Every structure is written in C-alpha cells, then in structure tokens.
Design a protein around this ligand. Structure first.
Ligand SMILES: CCCCCCCCCCCCCCCCCC(=O)OC[C@H](COP(=O)([O-])OCC(O)COP(=O)([O-])OC[C@@H](COC(=O)CCCCCCCCCCCCCCCCC)OC(=O)CCCCCCCCCCCCCCCCC)OC(=O)CCCCCCCCCCCCCCCCC
Ligand SMILES: CCCCCCCCCCCCCCCCCC(=O)OC[C@H](COP(=O)([O-])OCC(O)COP(=O)([O-])OC[C@@H](COC(=O)CCCCCCCCCCCCCCCCC)OC(=O)CCCCCCCCCCCCCCCCC)OC(=O)CCCCCCCCCCCCCCCCC
Ligand SMILES: CC(C)=CCC/C(C)=C/CC/C(C)=C\CC/C(C)=C\CC/C(C)=C\CC/C(C)=C\CC/C(C)=C\CC/C(C)=C\CC/C(C)=C\CC/C(C)=C\COP(=O)(O)O
Ligand SMILES: CC[C@@H](CO)NCCN[C@@H](CC)CO
Ligand SMILES: [Ca+2]
Lengths: 146, 436, 601, 80, 150, 36
C-alpha cells in the first residue's frame, strides 16, 4: 500500500461474499487530477493454489535467506564441497522491508555473499504466493531461477 | 510457545552445510571464510543436526543452560550475600522474575548468549568457592571455564571480569601457598590450563588460515571501533523491533538496581547481615562486563542477554537494600518507587513487536499499546507524577509523616511485582497470538 | 471560507460542488486568460490573514502599568519587613558595619587572563550555526509588524520566546556587523565570570583553608570556564544569557538563605521567569529555586509570629505572575496558542522518552556538531559532578569547604540535567547553559581530589587514569567548526593524528597502564602502607594540577587552531580577516561579498 | 548551658557548618577578623543560625561589638 | 577515456579566461536577496526581502551554502510543505545559476549564487493595491486555524 | 506602629499585582486588516 507502483496483486476473499453469488465485476474511479495519482487493472481470476511443500520438494537445492531458515526446516539448502557451489532452483526471502534492508545487503556480491554467484547465471523471477488464511499478511517471497 | 531470536535461520543454515564442506564456514557473507578463532560450539549443533533439525530439539542447550543458571543462582550465589538476602522471600521472587524477564526475549534462539551467561556465572562461583577454603584447584578450573567461554564468541570476553573481580583475596592464597610448595608448581598448572583452548581452536585450521579469515572479516564486515559504543544504546531507544518493550525492560531493571545499590552502599558503610565484599564483587563483575563489552567488533542489541544472570542477582540484593528495615525514611522509599514508575513509563513507550514469525497475531506489533485512545506510558507517567508529588511532600514534613500501613505495605517489594506483571504480559502476548 | 470550499454554476442543476475545509487554495496572484472589459458581476475579494499584527490599545496599557507598580510596592514592603525583623529601625537602611575585605593578587590575575581571552575570541571566533537565522529575523521584524519566523511555520510568530529578538532588532538598526551584534554574548561572559570569582568561590569555603585561598583551585576554575564557554557560546543564540541567569538566581537564593531575608528570594523568582522565556531550555534557571526551597520554607515558618503566612506568599506569587507583562505585551493568548499548535504540528519535535539522544548527538562519528572540544566540555562536567557526589556521599565532610552551598550546587546541576528532558528539541549546542557551573565544579573537584588523594596513592592514580580516559574519548572526533570556521583548521575532517597514527589510542594505552599501576598499589597495600606520601613542598602541587594542565592544553588547542588558520591563510578569506577589516574602516565593510568573484556572462 | 559546655560546643559546630572551619581551631582567645576569615555575610549567617538553636535575638546593631569569639561568650553570658 | 563502464565519460567544452567582478558590485546591497540560514551572517550588506502586511516581496537573487549543506539542511528546512519561502519562490519564479569563485582559494567549494526570473512578467501582472484598516478583537477569540498542512 | 503599614503594603499590593498582571493576556487588542 505504501509502494504505489508495484503490480501488487489485490485479493478478495471468497468466503465473505454470499454462497449463491453468480458474477462479479471491477469498478475503478481515479477522481484525482495529480499526474502521479493513476490506476491500472487486469481482469479477475480464481487461482489454483497448491502447497509449497508439494511444489518445492524436499530434495531440490534452495537458496534460503539467513532470516528464513528456522521456519523452513525441510527444504535442503545448497551445499559446497571444494570451493565449487551448487546451483539452486528457488530462493526464499523475508518480507519487503526486511529483504530490502537486511538480507539483500548482508549477502550481496561486493562483500562476498551468495548473491554474487546467482546474479551472473540464474536470472530470477518472482512467483504468486499467499498464506493459507492470512490474506492481508506478507510472509515473504519465492523466486524461481532460470 | 515462546518466541525465537533473529540469528536462528543463520546458525541453522550454516550448521546444516558444515558436514559436506568439511569445515565450519559462514556460507552467507564472507568469501567462504570460516569462523575458527571461535565457534567450537557450532560444531556441536552440526552434530545435533544428524538426529533431526526440529525446533524443539535444536534449542535444548538454551533450556538446560537457563535451568542450570537458576540452580546455581538460587543455591550458591544468594546464600552468600549474608543472612538477610537468604531468609527473605521477596529477594528470591525478585531474582526469579528478573531472570525470567531477561531470559525470555533474548536467550531462546540458537545464539550462544545463554551459554556465555552460564560460563560467566560458573567462573564467579568457582572463584568465590576457591576463596573460602584457601584452595587453588577451583581457581585453576575457573581459568579453563573462562578460556572456553571466550572461545565461543567475540562477545564472550566476560568471566574475565569475574576473574578480575576476585583478584585481591586470591593473591592472599597464591602468596600464602607460594611459601609451602615452591613457585613453579603454581604457574605450571595454571599455564597449561589457560593455554589449552588452542588445541580446540586450531584443531582443524592453522595459523595462516585464521589470520586470513581475520583480515577479510576486518577489512569488509561491520567492525566498529571502541569509541562507537554509544550505538548499542542508541539502537535501544528507537521505536522499532530492535528495541521494544520486551527488550528494554531486561536492561533497564538491571541498570536501575545497579545504580541504586551503589549510592546506598557508599553512604552506609556497614549494613547488618549483608556481608560486604561479595556485594561489592557482584557489582564489580557487572561494571567489568559493561567495560569489556566495549571492545567488541559488532554493537548489537542482542548482546544485552548476558546480563540475565547477574542482573537477577543484583535485583535480589537491591530488594533487601531498599527494604523498610535498611532504608528507614519514607521519602527515600517513595523516591525509589517514583523512579520505578518512570522506568516503566520509559519502557512502555514503544511497540510490542517480535521477530520474523513470532509476530504473527500478537496484539500491538506495529504501534504503541494505547489503551482507549490514551497511551500506557502516559498512564505510568501520571503514576510517576503522583508518587513524586508525595515524595516531594514528604521532603517538607516533620520526619514522621508517612509511616502508616498503606505506604509501608506498597513499598516492601515493588521489583518482584513489576517483573511479574511484565512476565505475565510476555506470556499473554504469545498465548493471544496462538489463540487467534 | 473556513469550514467549506465550493463552487456553483448558478443556473445549472449539476453544477454545485463542495469540499472539506482543507481544500483551500494557495493564492499567489490572480492570473486570468479572459481580457474582457470590467463587466458587473466579475470580481474577486481576498482577505489576508494578518492575525499577528496586534497592538495593545487603550486598556492593556493602563493595566500593564498598574501591575508593575503594585509589584514594586509589594517588594518594597517585603524589604521593609525584612529590615524590621533583624533589629534594625528602617532608618539605617544598608549601612555597613564590618570593613571590606580585599581581593588577592592571584584572583586579580585570573580575571586579566580570562577577560583577555574572551576579548580575543570575539575577533577570531567561531560564529555558531543560528546566527544567520536570528540576524535575518531581527532585520525583518521592524517592517513586518511583529517577530516572524521567516523561514518556516507559515509566517507564524515566536510569541513566548521573543523578548531577546526584540532587542537584537534594536541593535541591528545601528549597524549589522558581526563584532557589533555579538556584544551581549561577550558581556554576559565577562559578567558571568566576575560573579563567579567574586561571590561563588568565597561562598564555598570562606576561611583560612581553601577554595578561596587555594590558588590552583582558581586557575582551574578559570581554565574550565574558558573550555566550556569557547566552543558553545559565541553566536547570537541565547545560551550566554541563560548561563548568566542561572548564576544570578543561585547567587540571590544563597544571599536569601544566608542573610535570613526574603526579598532576594522574590527577585530570584523574577530573574528565573525572565530566563525561562529566552528559550524552551531556560527551565534550568528554575533549578536553584527547587534545591533551595526547604531552607526558604524554614525561614517563612520561622518568622510567622511577627508577620503572617500570607504577607510573604502574596509577594512570592505576585512576582511569579509578572512575566505576563513581558510575554503578552502584544500577541494575546489566542495567537500564542495558535503559534504553539503550529510549531508542534509542523516541525521536528522530540518526545520526552527520547531525551537520551542528546548524548548520542554529542558523541557520534564526524558530525562537527559533536566535534572535539565539545565532548571535552561535557565529559569534564559529568566527571566533576559525579566525583564530588561520591566524595560527599562517602565521608560527609571535606574540611575546608562548606557543605550547604556544595550540596545545593550539586543539586542545581543534577536537577538542571534532569529538567532538560522536557525540551521539544534535543540539539547538542544546548549544553552551553552550564558554562558558569562548570567552572565552580572544576574548582571544587581540584580542591577535594588534592586532599583525598594525598593520603593515598591508588586514589591519586585513579584520578589520572580517569582524566586520561576522558581525553581518549574527547580526541576521537574531528576538530571542526560550523561552515567558515573550518577554513584552515588543522584537522577539520579527520580525527587528530600525529604520524598517520590516531591519538585516541595513544591515550587509551596510557589509561590502561595507569589503571594497572593503580591496581598494583591496591594489591601492594596488603604488605605496606598507603598514607606515607609526604607532602613537603613538591607533592603539594602535584595532586592539584592534573585537571588544570588538561584544561589549559585544550583551551590552547582551541585558540591556536583559529590563530594559525588566520595567520597562515592570508590574504585568503577567513572569519578573522572580516572582523579585523570591519573594526578598522569604521564599521562599514561587506565581509564575504567582497572576496567572492562572479562571472555575469 | 552556663559556660564552655555549650557556649563553645555549639558555636564551634555552627562555625564549622557555615564556613567549613574545623572545630579543632575554635578557641575563645582569637578574633573573627584576625585569625579566622569571617566577612559580613558569614557573621550574619552565624548570628542567624545561632537564633534557631538557642533562641536569643542578636540584632545587627549588636554583632558589631563582638570582636572575638570570647566576646560572644561574654555577651551571651550577660544575657544569661 | 579508456574505461568501458557505462558510467565513465566526461563531455567537455572549450576553455575560457573569465572576466570576473566582485559580488558586491553584482548584487549591490539594495536588491532583495534570499540568503539561506548558513549564508546570512557572512553577507551583512545584502538585504533580505520584506514581508509587509502579510504579503511577501519577490526576491531577485539567492545565495546558498555548499553542496553537502544545501542538500542536507537548507533545502528541507525551508520547504513549501513546512511553510518556508519556497512556498512562493517556486510557484512564481524560475531559477538560474551564476559562475562564482572564491578569490585566491581555487580549491574551495563555498556556496553558489542563483538568479530569479519572473514566470509572468510584471509588465502584465503588476503588484497589488492591498487595502488596510483596523479593528478591535478580544484576547480569547480565535477565527479558525491556519492551514498548516503538508 | 511601623509594622502594620509594612504588613498591609505587602498583602494589598501583592493581591492587586497578582490579579492585574494575570488578566493582561485576555484584554482587547488592536488588529489591522488587509483586503485585495
Ligand atoms: C561508577 C563507578 C563505580 C563507583 C564506585 C565508587 C568507588 C568505589 C568506592 C569503594 O570504596 O569501593 C571500591 C573498593 C573499596 O570499597 P570498600 O568499602 O573499601 O570495601 C571494599 C570491599 O571490601 C571489596 O573490595 P575488593 O578489593 O575485594 O573488591 C573491589 C571491588 C571493586 O568495587 C567496584 O569496582 C565497584 C564499582 O571489586 C573489584 O575490584 C572489581 C574491579 C573491576 C574491574 C573492571 C574494570 C573497570 C571497572 C570500572 C569501569 C567502569 C566501566 C564503564 C564503561 C561504560 C562505557 C559506556 O575498592 C576500589 O575502589 C577498587 C580500586 C582498585 C580498582 C583498580 C582499577
Ligand atoms: C530529584 C532527584 C535528585 C535530586 C538531587 C538533589 C541532590 O542531589 O541533593 C541536594 C539538594 C538538597 O540537599 P540539602 O537539602 O541541602 O542537604 C543535603 C543533606 O545535607 C544530605 O543530603 P540527603 O541526605 O538529603 O541526600 C540527598 C539525596 C538525594 O536527594 C533525594 O533523593 C531527593 C528526593 C526528594 C524528591 C524526589 C522526587 C522524585 C525523584 C525521582 C527521580 C526520577 C527521575 C526523574 C526524571 C524527571 O542524596 C543523593 O543525592 C543520592 C544520589 C542522588 C542521585 C543523583 C542523580 C544524578 C542524576 C544525574 C543525571 C545526569 C544524566 C547522566 C547521563 C549520562 C549518559 C552518558 O537537592 C534537593 O533537595 C532537590 C530536591 C528537589 C526538591 C523538590 C521540591 C519540589 C518543590
Ligand atoms: C584466562 C586466559 C584467557 C581468559 C584467555 C586466553 C584465550 C586464548 C589464549 C585464545 C582464544 C581466542 C582469542 C585469543 C580471541 C581474542 C578475542 C578478543 C580478545 C577480542 C575479539 C576481537 C577479535 C580478535 C576478532 C577477530 C576477528 C574478527 C571477528 C574481527 C571482527 C570483524 C567481524 C565483524 C567479525 C565477525 C564477528 C563475529 C566473529 C561474530 C559476530 O557476532 P554477532 O554480532 O554477529 O552475533
Ligand atoms: C545482520 C545480521 C547479523 C545478526 O543480527 N548477523 C550476525 C552474524 N551471526 C553470527 C552467528 C550468529 C555470524 O557468525
Ligand atoms: Ca489521475
């Protein structure tokens, strides 16, 4: 909400509208004439929402940030043996403020860090994730490396 | 049901990858450099992760450490500051409650603060036991304990304070034993004991490797100078999660008692049944701890968890020094009560925030408590103003004004009550976060 | 208008519209694009605010006179009551009986060395931050119609704290030079030192003992006063006036307690409420009244059989309620409340529970606001406060120093440092209101630690290691001044180094070695004595001059930096060349607008 | 309360409390202005604080003739 | 330029030997100026613009402190959301820059000077003829708040 | 009796100076207007 240009994926809980609801439709206004008060929308959809222990298995290498290691105790971080590191498949990150202020600067590449390897050959992109019943809470992120 | 620290995923992730690499690496920031002037304790979590990496199983040392700290505190330290600290219920309750409220927010995760706080108490106990029978064996085991505590973390440069505190009545033992059996079979064993941590520090690495790791960590990482110590206290008075109403109380309740016991023990030279000298070594330990905490590379608020076992023993002493039997005038006791209310008003003027996933559901995680539009620090400030008004009235009074049973009752044990109220608040936070 | 902002095409149904009262425009003209005649119905009528341009009127000028007349009559009556209670006959009104006591040659030689330095620093000074602010406010106030802020807060007044700017506005009409507008800040240092050296050091130990006869404890006071006055009080900021009001209040309260009178205690209230309206950090002047209040209540209740309990309290309240005549001479209660509301809503304010980021702003990394020689003046203040506090708690006496005045001085300093909590701004320059107390605290410390440190060696060594530790803290910030005082100063962006090696470690090693020697004496006292330090003639003056030396080298380092800059960069511009050029050639010379070249095309 | 049992035993305490002068050197042969160093302010403070212990009015036109500390002895003895 | 980073280049311009004149001869101690807070005790002959009857007088120049001082204090103390002179010296004027040097000291980054040009020239948007009067108000009345909002 | 006068001149002129200097901020004042 405090980042007004972010492609932020608004969400409306289905359990609030009545049981027998036939249709929906979007309504947008933009009554402000400031050049930096604008609006943009896409049609509504009903996601499919599988789990994260079922999508990300328990054997694929994951780049867990240093803040998210005790909540994900089954995710098999990426190892290194003789100076050579492994190539991860995903990256798990804390919420926006923490990721921006603590983890992205602690482990960046100009001071060692693991984000000096994955920046040169991996080309990450973000995914759509939610908490099972805290629709208005930001748990973190989940990126995919290609 | 309790919260955890911030450095739990850190240590877990760098302990889960340390059996494949072949050495204890940092794995997150520096150029694969290990941590091996220190970190013999992480090689134990690396072994524990073989059974399972659950959360109830990986934080068992931090529970055993707190239980052993209470066992030592209530049975070796308190029945030593005289027959008045023992044979007194408010003192034991104050020690228990301060230990709980200083161990709750800090020493629950995987950080070794809770092990350093125990190694810093075993040293004090062994020294105060050595200087009771004029023996030298506990004074040789205290050196081993201090070395193995320093070899855990750079902030483990304490129990050197506990060695320095009991230093004058230990020379009376060294000297009087030097006359019996030579002088070489007194500095050979205590040299071999003190210089044995090197076989655990350099058991895997070498000297050049430790030097290169140190050079990298010092040229790159956050390594502050000794004259930037005020950052540790500046981070504590900000309205953030790094310093909140759960992480301010543990340090403030220790500083208040430490500073109010000095003013009383300076004026009153001899206090009946308080056993002066251990009461002074107990404050020397805390002052030396605060002085040695200045020469550390990193100035975090996490390092305020070391005062969980000396602050608990300072509260039990202050509860006896400010009692209606040692502090005889009502004005002084009302002044102490007003100081407590001011400390509470200062502590409650921030958020109720916890860390990464411990903040899911707790009521006032992102704002000030603010019961019914008006904050709670304002209520504690009103209480402080009333208590200070009564103290100021007792200043202009014929020396026998306030002696009834009401203000004699409400000034017998305020520290246990305040600390118990705070502990109940801490437990209610997590219970209300679990329920909803 | 207020409570509404709308528009209405009259003969159209869906033309009307209204908005909240914070949707008001920001008028700066009327810029049409019509160019059509002067038809009837085309108009516009703007009402400017102009709510701070009030003038007293018929009333509020007779009451503002009857009030001060009644207050003067009340204080004269209280003085007559005072004269009657001491056996006098109110006809020998202040006829002295005991002869005057002279002033020693050592006390007439520190005055000539402190006043000379305060005069030299007036020409090669430092000119702190809020000088352009107050100079512009004082140059604009005469024509605006009131004392406006002119830089912030929507042109609002400064209603409570503007009786000093109204005097600066009178000085800035004769001439607006820098050596003329900064004269009060120097006379208030000359007077602040004369009061100290003539009254305060004689109130604390007036006998054949010390603190009046000890010569080193006078030079120590001078040096510490200078080291606390130079880095803080040289601009137009009102700290040099608060530092004098505090001492005047202390002096009057002590005179009232000693003589057994109440009229000086009623003039002290007037001076305190006059100092409290110079700046929000003027609450410090109300600390002596709080410390010396039980000794005044004892006097009020002692003599209540001759007079009553209403005669002194009426005057003590009428004197407190006299500051309204100076605050609301214009700017009625409504405008003052509005100004305060605006300054709290807009603008940076800090809450009372963040009162301790005032010692963080002081000891921080580069921050010329927390530079070296600003840390020294505060660390020495705290050191000399707590040392005397401990030596007074333990061993209640000092045997050469009166304990009543000393306890009241300690209380004044502590209550001032505790009352600085409720100030809305927490800068680091607000520590300049303790310059008067720093001198007397340094004198008292130099006197006590010279006799409690002569019957032992570990105490004499702990004194020195604490001084070395304070020096280690001080010499770890840059030696920087504000904006143009930095032109040529030796270390204005880095901390002091000798040969690529910082001094803040060369002092910490010495502190550690001296502490080790102190511990060695502590251990060795188990097999020998400690009082064997014979005070023949050399050890006498060696335990009384560890602080004098440090303060002298710090003052010399503060003065020599500016002198070296001025002498070495010439004819290049420096803040001393401007003043020495304005002194000659009348007082008409543009300081920096003449050393700056410009290329129009 | 006749002589030398409070006449000096309380005066040498008031003088110590006011000027810091040690009571070891308060003997009835030395004058205030000559041996000690007591100005008008200290003289009046002593005369005011001696009225609270042993309430006896010492007016300001009276302490001009109390030259020595033994003169206070003789004066307050005359009052007795 | 041998470096291939995308942020290394310099784009120069031909040389010139400037013809300089003092700042006292340029501004002249008679025109309205907007000295900042830092650069106001060093220029005691230049006069600031007046504010008579709640209406301001538009300045013609502006004197700033150095870059580290302007970026940190002078630009965000005298904002328009806080009530400073940028309230109307940014909605009514257009700023420029003048090349200034400190005589003899060619290593010194003192301040800067900037010129002000009207957006709407005063030949078609002249000044106002604001009236004036006098009333009598009590000491407790308050006619609504001042719009002290950002 | 030179004591009664000196005692009344401190009560009367104390109460008067407390009640007169306490209503100064609430008295009428002359304000200037401006309209374009
Ligand atoms: C505030 C600072 C502390 C205020 C205390 C005022 C002075 C104390 C006066 C006093 O009589 O007690 C001290 C004590 C004497 O007390 P006592 O009534 O005579 O009885 C003594 C007892 O029997 C017991 O005497 P003991 O000799 O058996 O034990 C002495 C006791 C010592 O007692 C104490 O030290 C209490 C303090 O224990 C120690 O010696 C511990 C020494 C601590 C060493 C740590 C290094 C630094 C200490 C202080 C540094 C402050 C750091 C703050 C930095 C913060 C940065 C932001 O002896 C000392 O002063 C120590 C002097 C030697 C120290 C060498 C350095
Ligand atoms: C206020 C609290 C401290 C007052 C300090 C005043 C003082 O030290 O004594 C001299 C002086 C009186 O001495 P004295 O009566 O001539 O006789 C001395 C006796 O011969 C013999 O004296 P005594 O036996 O009466 O003992 C006096 C007693 C002390 O007297 C009392 O306890 C008075 C209690 C009665 C009123 C209590 C009100 C509530 C106070 C609660 C404090 C909460 C904090 C408040 C913050 C706001 O002794 C102490 O001083 C103990 C130690 C005091 C601690 C000093 C605090 C230093 C703080 C410095 C802060 C600087 C920050 C550094 C940060 C650095 C970071 C790097 O102080 C006062 O009486 C002030 C009392 C205020 C009057 C209230 C009347 C209202 C109208
Ligand atoms: C009795 C005998 C006794 C008491 C002791 C003898 C013990 C001994 C002979 C050897 C043990 C190892 C030893 C001598 C250590 C010296 C440690 C000291 C005195 C101070 C600590 C400073 C040092 C040496 C740091 C070394 C490299 C380093 C860590 C530089 C710091 C830069 C950074 C940021 C490092 C990482 C910080 C860290 C290691 C952990 C971070 O803690 P965190 O904040 O993150 O929780
Ligand atoms: C910004 C993150 C900080 C902790 O807050 N990480 C500290 C490093 N943690 C140590 C192990 C706890 C490294 O050895
Ligand atoms: Ca829009």
């Amino acid at each position: 909400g405090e980042q007004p240009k972010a492609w932020r994926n608004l969400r409306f809980a289905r359990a609030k509208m009545p049981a027998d609801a036939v249709a929906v439709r979007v309504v947008a206004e933009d009554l402000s004439l400031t050049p930096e008060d604008w609006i943009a929308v896409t049609p509504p959809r009903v996601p499919d929402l599988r789990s994260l222990q079922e999508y990300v298995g328990s054997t694929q290498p994951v780049l867990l940030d240093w803040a998210v290691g005790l909540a994900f105790p089954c995710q098999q971080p990426m190892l290194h043996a003789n100076g050579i590191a492994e190539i991860p498949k995903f990256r798990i990150t804390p919420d926006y403020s923490a990721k921006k202020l603590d983890t992205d600067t602690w482990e960046d590449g100009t001071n060692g860090g693991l984000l000096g390897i994955t920046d040169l050959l991996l080309r990450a992109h973000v995914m759509a994730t939610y908490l099972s019943r805290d629709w208005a809470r930001d748990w973190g992120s989940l990126r995919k490396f290609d | 049901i309790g919260a955890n620290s911030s450095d739990d995923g850190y240590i877990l992730g760098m302990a889960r990858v340390a059996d494949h690499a072949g050495y204890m690496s940092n794995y997150f920031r520096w150029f694969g450099s290990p941590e091996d002037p220190f970190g013999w304790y992480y090689n134990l979590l690396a072994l524990m992760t073989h059974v399972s990496d659950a959360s109830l199983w990986m934080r068992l040392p931090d529970l055993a450490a707190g239980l052993v700290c209470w066992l030592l505190l209530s049975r070796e330290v308190l029945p030593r500051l005289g027959p008045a600290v023992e044979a007194s219920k408010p003192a034991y309750w104050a020690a228990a409650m301060v230990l709980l409220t200083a161990w709750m927010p800090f020493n629950n995760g995987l950080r070794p603060e809770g092990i350093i706080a125990l190694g810093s108490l075993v040293t004090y106990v062994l020294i105060e036991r050595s200087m009771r029978y004029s023996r030298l064996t506990p004074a040789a085991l205290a050196v081993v304990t201090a070395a193995f505590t320093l070899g855990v973390q750079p902030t483990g440069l304490i129990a050197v304070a506990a060695l320095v505190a009991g230093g004058r009545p230990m020379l009376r033992i060294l000297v009087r034993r030097h006359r019996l059996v030579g002088t070489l079979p007194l500095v050979s064993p205590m040299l071999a004991a003190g210089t044995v941590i090197l076989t655990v520090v350099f058991a895997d690495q070498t000297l050049s490797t430790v030097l290169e790791a140190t050079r990298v960590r010092a040229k790159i990482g956050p390594s502050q100078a000794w004259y930037t110590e005020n950052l540790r206290y500046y981070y504590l008075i900000l309205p953030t999660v790094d310093g909140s109403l759960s992480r301010r109380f543990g340090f403030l309740i220790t500083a208040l008692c430490l500073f109010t016991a000095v003013f009383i023990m300076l004026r009153r030279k001899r206090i009946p049944s308080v056993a002066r000298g251990p009461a002074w070594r107990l404050m020397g330990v805390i002052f030396g701890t605060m002085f040695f905490l200045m020469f550390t590379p990193t100035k975090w608020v996490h390092h305020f968890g070391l005062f969980a076992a000396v602050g608990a023993a300072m509260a039990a002493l202050t509860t006896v020094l400010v009692s209606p039997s040692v502090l005889r005038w009502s004005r002084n006791r009302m002044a102490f009560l007003a100081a407590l209310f001011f400390l509470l008003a200062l502590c409650w003027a921030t958020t109720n925030g916890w860390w990464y996933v411990s903040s899911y559901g707790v009521p006032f995680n992102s704002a000030m408590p603010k019961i019914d539009g008006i904050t709670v620090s304002t209520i504690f400030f009103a209480l402080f103003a009333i208590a200070a008004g009564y103290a100021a009235w007792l200043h202009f009074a014929p020396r026998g004004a306030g002696e009834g049973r009401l203000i004699r009752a409400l000034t017998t044990a305020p520290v246990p009550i305040v600390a118990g109220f705070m502990a109940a608040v801490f437990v209610a936070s997590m219970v209300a976060g679990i329920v909803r | 208008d207020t409570g509404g902002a709308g528009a209405d095409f009259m003969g159209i149904p869906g033309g009307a519209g209204t908005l909240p009262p914070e949707k008001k425009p920001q008028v700066g003209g009327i810029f049409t694009d019509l160019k059509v005649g002067a038809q009837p119905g085309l108009s516009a009528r703007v009402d400017i605010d102009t709510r701070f341009i009030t003038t007293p009127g018929a009333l509020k000028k007779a009451v503002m006179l009857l009030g001060v007349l009644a207050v003067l009559v009340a204080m004269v009556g209280l003085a007559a009551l005072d004269r009657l209670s001491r056996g006098r006959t109110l006809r020998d009104w202040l006829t002295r009986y005991r002869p005057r006591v002279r002033v020693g040659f050592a006390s007439r030689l520190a005055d000539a060395a402190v006043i000379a330095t305060l005069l030299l620093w007036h020409v090669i000074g430092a000119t702190s931050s809020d000088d352009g602010y107050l100079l512009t406010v004082a140059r604009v106030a005469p024509k605006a119609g009131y004392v406006a802020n002119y830089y912030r807060y929507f042109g609002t007044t400064e209603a409570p704290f503007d009786w000093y700017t109204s005097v600066l506005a009178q000085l800035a009409a004769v001439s607006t030079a820098g050596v003329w507008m900064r004269l009060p800040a120097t006379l208030a240092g000359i007077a602040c030192w004369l009061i100290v050296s003539r009254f305060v050091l004689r109130r604390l130990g007036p006998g054949p003992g010390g603190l009046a006869s000890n010569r080193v404890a006078v030079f120590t006071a001078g040096a510490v006063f200078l080291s606390a006055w130079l880095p803080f009080n040289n601009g137009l900021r009102p700290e040099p006036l608060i530092a004098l009001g505090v001492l005047v209040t202390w002096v009057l309260v002590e005179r009232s307690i000693a003589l057994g009178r109440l009229a000086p205690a009623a003039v002290a209230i007037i001076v305190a409420t006059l100092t409290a309206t110079l700046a929000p950090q003027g609450l410090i002047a109300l600390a002596p009244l709080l410390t010396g209040a039980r000794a005044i209540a004892q006097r009020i209740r002692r003599r209540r059989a001759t007079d009553g309990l209403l005669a002194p309290l009426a005057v003590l309240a009428a004197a407190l309620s006299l500051i309204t005549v100076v605050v609301f001479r214009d700017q009625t209660l409504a405008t003052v409340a509005e100004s305060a509301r605006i300054k709290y809503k807009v603008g940076p304010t800090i809450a009372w529970y963040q009162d301790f980021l005032r010692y963080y702003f002081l000891t921080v990394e580069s921050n010329v606001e927390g530079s070296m020689s600003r840390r020294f003046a505060v660390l020495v203040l705290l050191f000399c406060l707590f040392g005397v506090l401990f030596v007074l708690l333990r061993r209640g006496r000092v045997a050469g120093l009166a304990s009543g005045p000393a306890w009241r001085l300690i209380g004044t300093t502590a209550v001032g440092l505790l009352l600085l909590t409720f100030t809305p701004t927490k800068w680091a320059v607000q520590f300049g209101a303790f310059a008067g107390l720093a001198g007397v605290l340094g004198a008292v410390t130099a006197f006590t630690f010279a006799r409690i440190g002569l019957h032992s060696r570990r105490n004499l060594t702990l004194y020195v290691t604490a001084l070395l530790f304070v020096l280690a803290w001080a010499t770890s910030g840059i030696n920087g001044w504000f904006y143009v005082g930095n032109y040529g100063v030796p270390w204005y962006d880095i901390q002091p180094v000798i040969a690529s090696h910082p001094v803040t470690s060369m002092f910490l090693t010495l502190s550690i070695l001296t502490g080790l020697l102190a511990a060695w004496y502590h251990f060795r006292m188990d097999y020998a004595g400690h009082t064997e330090v014979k005070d023949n003639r050399r050890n006498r003056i060696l335990a009384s001059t560890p602080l004098l030396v440090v303060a002298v080298i710090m003052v010399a380092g503060e003065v020599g930096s500016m002198a070296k800059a001025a002498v070495f960069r010439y004819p290049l511009y420096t803040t001393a060349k401007a003043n020495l050029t304005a002194l000659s050639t009348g007082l008409s010379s543009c300081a920096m607008a003449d050393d700056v070249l410009a290329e129009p095309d | 309360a006749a002589t030398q049992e409070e006449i000096i035993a309380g005066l040498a305490e008031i003088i110590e409390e006011v000027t810091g002068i040690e009571p070891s050197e308060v003997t009835p042969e030395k004058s205030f202005v000559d041996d000690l160093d007591i100005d008008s302010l200290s003289m009046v403070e002593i005369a005011v604080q001696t009225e609270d212990k042993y309430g006896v009015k010492i007016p300001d036109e009276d302490l001009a003739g109390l030259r020595t500390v033994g003169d206070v002895v003789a004066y307050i003895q005359k009052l007795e | 330029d041998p470096n291939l980073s995308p942020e290394q280049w310099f784009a120069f311009t031909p040389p010139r030997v400037p013809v300089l004149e003092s700042l006292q001869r340029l501004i002249g101690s008679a025109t309205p100026v907007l000295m900042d807070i830092a650069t106001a005790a060093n220029f005691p002959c230049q006069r600031p613009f007046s504010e008579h009857l709640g209406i301001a007088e538009l300045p013609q120049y502006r004197i700033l402190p150095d870059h580290k001082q302007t970026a940190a204090s002078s630009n965000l103390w005298q904002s328009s959301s806080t009530g400073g002179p940028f309230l109307f010296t940014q909605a009514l004027l257009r700023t420029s820059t003048i090349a200034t040097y400190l005589r003899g000291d060619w290593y010194r980054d003192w301040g800067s000077v900037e010129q002000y040009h009207r957006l709407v020239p005063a030949d078609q948007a002249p000044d106002a003829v604001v009236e004036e009067g006098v009333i009598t108000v009590p000491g407790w009345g308050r006619p609504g708040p001042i719009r002290a909002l950002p | 009796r030179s004591h009664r006068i000196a005692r009344l001149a401190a009560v009367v002129s104390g109460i008067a100076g407390l009640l007169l200097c306490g209503i100064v901020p609430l008295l009428p004042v002359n304000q200037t207007t401006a309209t374009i």
